[PDB]
Amino acid sequence: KIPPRWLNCPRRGQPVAGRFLPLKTMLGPRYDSQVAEENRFHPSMLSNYLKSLKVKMGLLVDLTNTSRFYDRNDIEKEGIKYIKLQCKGHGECPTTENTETFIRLCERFPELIGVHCTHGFNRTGFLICAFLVEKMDWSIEAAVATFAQARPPGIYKGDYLKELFRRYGDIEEAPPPPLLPDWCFEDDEGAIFLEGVTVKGVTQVTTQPKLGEVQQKCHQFCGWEGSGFPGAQPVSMDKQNIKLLDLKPYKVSWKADGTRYMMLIDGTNEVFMIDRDNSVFHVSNLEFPFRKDLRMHLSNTLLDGEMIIDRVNGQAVPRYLIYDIIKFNSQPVGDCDFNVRLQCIEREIISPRHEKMKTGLIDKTQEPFSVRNKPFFDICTSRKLLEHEMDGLIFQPTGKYKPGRCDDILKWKPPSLNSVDFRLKITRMGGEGLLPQNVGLLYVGGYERPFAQIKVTKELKQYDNKIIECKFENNSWVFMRQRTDKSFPNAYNTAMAVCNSISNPVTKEMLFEFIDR
Ligand SMILES: *O[C@H]1[C@@H](O)[C@H](n2cnc3c(=O)[nH]c(N)nc32)O[C@@H]1COP(=O)(O)OP(=O)(O)OP(=O)(O)O
């Protein structure tokens, strides 16, 4: 497999001290099936560039401790000396012995000296700076700064910088590691608030100070240990799920197809929406008055629900259904009974707003969207629900609120409407071999390899590296609609849950006859 974070890494930086050309590792043609043409870095590319500039490379120093990336003969056949310099492993910075070896080698060799590790930043910069200080009489400050400016923030491991300053300067003056650019983490695993409608007063929060704060407060309100969206995740009903409806009290509601959003009400104009991607949106003119003091405003409140699109003919009106509440005025309402929290919603959220809605002090035609609560019923009447618009049903246990995956919150969906959000990675291939049968692939969060594949189409290349919602039918994933509001695909566990559902489904009649008797 190609190394991580390599596709987005620049191939080369600017020459350092007029002598050293820092590089990421080349990848030979053996990796062409994993690397698109625009991202390829064969050794021939480096030699051809140098030839185009009438520049010779005297020596190439390989710091990767491996021969699996490319063929050294591709370098040596061009008259470039190749040396594989083994460096200390276990993540430690190069030893004094490694630096002496590097200096002894390089002082033998106007022509450039190429230096590369897997990515071309930490080992490469460490050795280059060591040479600059020991042999060219640079200050370590100047060496580190110059390498940072040549290959962007050249050394980003803090212990590397600390050791460089310990060897060549004052360790107490070692700089902290630089903040990393966004491209570093694009391969580790949405700007549109609501898809299809444009919504006033709602503007995404990218301000670095307040973004982390809103996310942090939501984490702490939910008791969420990991990173990411803290809200409860329902799982698709299968023939082994439905038996849970007999084992404890449950409430049902129709599921409109909508966009999950927690709403944090932290102050006066502090109203924020959070989607599954952890993206934050600031809402301006939504007012949440305190029940007891109608002049005062709510703080430390956390909600949960969907944003749905209602159609009042000729125009589509946004609506935000509140279908749970996590915290209220710092009171852990989420630990109370689901009926207690439904009443908390109704009596402490909808009612104080609806008092000032008949006083003229609150104008609903000023507000960004309509705020309602989702009705819940007993399963008994769910049967009648099977006898605004809903694409399925949701079954809520009456227990306390739980973040993360909830095996006991059941989404039932008619089997033909099951869908999964994939990250589309299109990889044009030869396939048959005479006719180039190109085939795109699909990805899920938390799984490194592809979850499955898809057939490449001309209409499909349109959304590439994007997110696509796919229905399953005819033993193939089928594109149905692009998803503009997700920067992230479904989790591997969510995708496997959907597959478990489709291969062991619950038909409408079966759910009907389970509920009835
Ligand atoms: O053949 C591999 C592999 O068998 C062996 N290896 C790596 N990790 C372990 C381990 O935790 N336990 C055992 N028993 N064996 C292990 O190492 C061989 C390859 O060595 P590498 O050079 O690839 O080690 P690497 O440089 O990748 O480590 P690092 O520099 O990324 O930290």
Swiss-Prot record:
<feature type="binding site">
    <location>
        <position position="276"/>
    </location>
    <ligand>
        <name>GTP</name>
    </ligand>
</feature>
<dbReference type="Pfam" id="PF03919">
    <property type="entry name" value="mRNA_cap_C"/>
</dbReference>
<keyword id="KW-0342">GTP-binding</keyword>
<dbReference type="InterPro" id="IPR001339">
    <property type="entry name" value="mRNA_cap_enzyme_adenylation"/>
</dbReference>
<feature type="active site" description="Phosphocysteine intermediate">
    <location>
        <position position="117"/>
    </location>
</feature>
<feature type="region of interest" description="Interaction with POLR2A">
    <location>
        <begin position="291"/>
        <end position="347"/>
    </location>
</feature>
<keyword id="KW-0808">Transferase</keyword>
<keyword id="KW-0507">mRNA processing</keyword>
<dbReference type="InterPro" id="IPR029021">
    <property type="entry name" value="Prot-tyrosine_phosphatase-like"/>
</dbReference>
<comment type="subunit">
    <text>(Microbial infection) Interacts with HIV-1 Tat.</text>
</comment>
<feature type="active site" description="N6-GMP-lysine intermediate">
    <location>
        <position position="255"/>
    </location>
</feature>
<dbReference type="GO" id="GO:0004484">
    <property type="term" value="F:mRNA guanylyltransferase activity"/>
</dbReference>
<feature type="region of interest" description="GTase">
    <location>
        <begin position="190"/>
        <end position="517"/>
    </location>
</feature>
<keyword id="KW-0378">Hydrolase</keyword>
<dbReference type="GO" id="GO:0004651">
    <property type="term" value="F:polynucleotide 5'-phosphatase activity"/>
</dbReference>
<dbReference type="GO" id="GO:0005524">
    <property type="term" value="F:ATP binding"/>
</dbReference>
<keyword id="KW-0548">Nucleotidyltransferase</keyword>
<keyword id="KW-0547">Nucleotide-binding</keyword>
<dbReference type="GO" id="GO:0005525">
    <property type="term" value="F:GTP binding"/>
</dbReference>
<protein>
    <recommendedName>
        <fullName>mRNA-capping enzyme</fullName>
        <ecNumber>3.6.1.74</ecNumber>
        <ecNumber>2.7.7.50</ecNumber>
    </recommendedName>
</protein>
<dbReference type="GO" id="GO:0005654">
    <property type="term" value="C:nucleoplasm"/>
</dbReference>
<dbReference type="InterPro" id="IPR051029">
    <property type="entry name" value="mRNA_Capping_Enz/RNA_Phosphat"/>
</dbReference>
<dbReference type="GO" id="GO:0006396">
    <property type="term" value="P:RNA processing"/>
</dbReference>
<dbReference type="GO" id="GO:0005634">
    <property type="term" value="C:nucleus"/>
</dbReference>
<comment type="function">
    <text>Bifunctional mRNA-capping enzyme exhibiting RNA 5'-triphosphate monophosphatase activity in the N-terminal part and mRNA guanylyltransferase activity in the C-terminal part. Catalyzes the first two steps of cap formation: by removing the gamma-phosphate from the 5'-triphosphate end of nascent mRNA to yield a diphosphate end, and by transferring the GMP moiety of GTP to the 5'-diphosphate terminus of RNA via a covalent enzyme-GMP reaction intermediate.</text>
</comment>
<dbReference type="GO" id="GO:0006370">
    <property type="term" value="P:7-methylguanosine mRNA capping"/>
</dbReference>
<feature type="binding site">
    <location>
        <begin position="481"/>
        <end position="486"/>
    </location>
    <ligand>
        <name>GTP</name>
    </ligand>
</feature>
<keyword id="KW-0506">mRNA capping</keyword>
<keyword id="KW-0904">Protein phosphatase</keyword>
<dbReference type="Pfam" id="PF00782">
    <property type="entry name" value="DSPc"/>
</dbReference>
<keyword id="KW-0539">Nucleus</keyword>
<comment type="similarity">
    <text>In the N-terminal section; belongs to the non-receptor class of the protein-tyrosine phosphatase family.</text>
</comment>
<dbReference type="GO" id="GO:0004721">
    <property type="term" value="F:phosphoprotein phosphatase activity"/>
</dbReference>
<feature type="domain" description="Tyrosine-protein phosphatase">
    <location>
        <begin position="21"/>
        <end position="174"/>
    </location>
</feature>
<dbReference type="InterPro" id="IPR000340">
    <property type="entry name" value="Dual-sp_phosphatase_cat-dom"/>
</dbReference>
<dbReference type="InterPro" id="IPR020422">
    <property type="entry name" value="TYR_PHOSPHATASE_DUAL_dom"/>
</dbReference>
<dbReference type="InterPro" id="IPR012340">
    <property type="entry name" value="NA-bd_OB-fold"/>
</dbReference>
<comment type="similarity">
    <text>In the C-terminal section; belongs to the eukaryotic GTase family.</text>
</comment>
<dbReference type="GO" id="GO:0140818">
    <property type="term" value="F:mRNA 5'-triphosphate monophosphatase activity"/>
</dbReference>
<feature type="binding site">
    <location>
        <begin position="304"/>
        <end position="306"/>
    </location>
    <ligand>
        <name>GTP</name>
    </ligand>
</feature>
<feature type="binding site">
    <location>
        <position position="260"/>
    </location>
    <ligand>
        <name>GTP</name>
    </ligand>
</feature>
<feature type="region of interest" description="TPase">
    <location>
        <begin position="1"/>
        <end position="189"/>
    </location>
</feature>
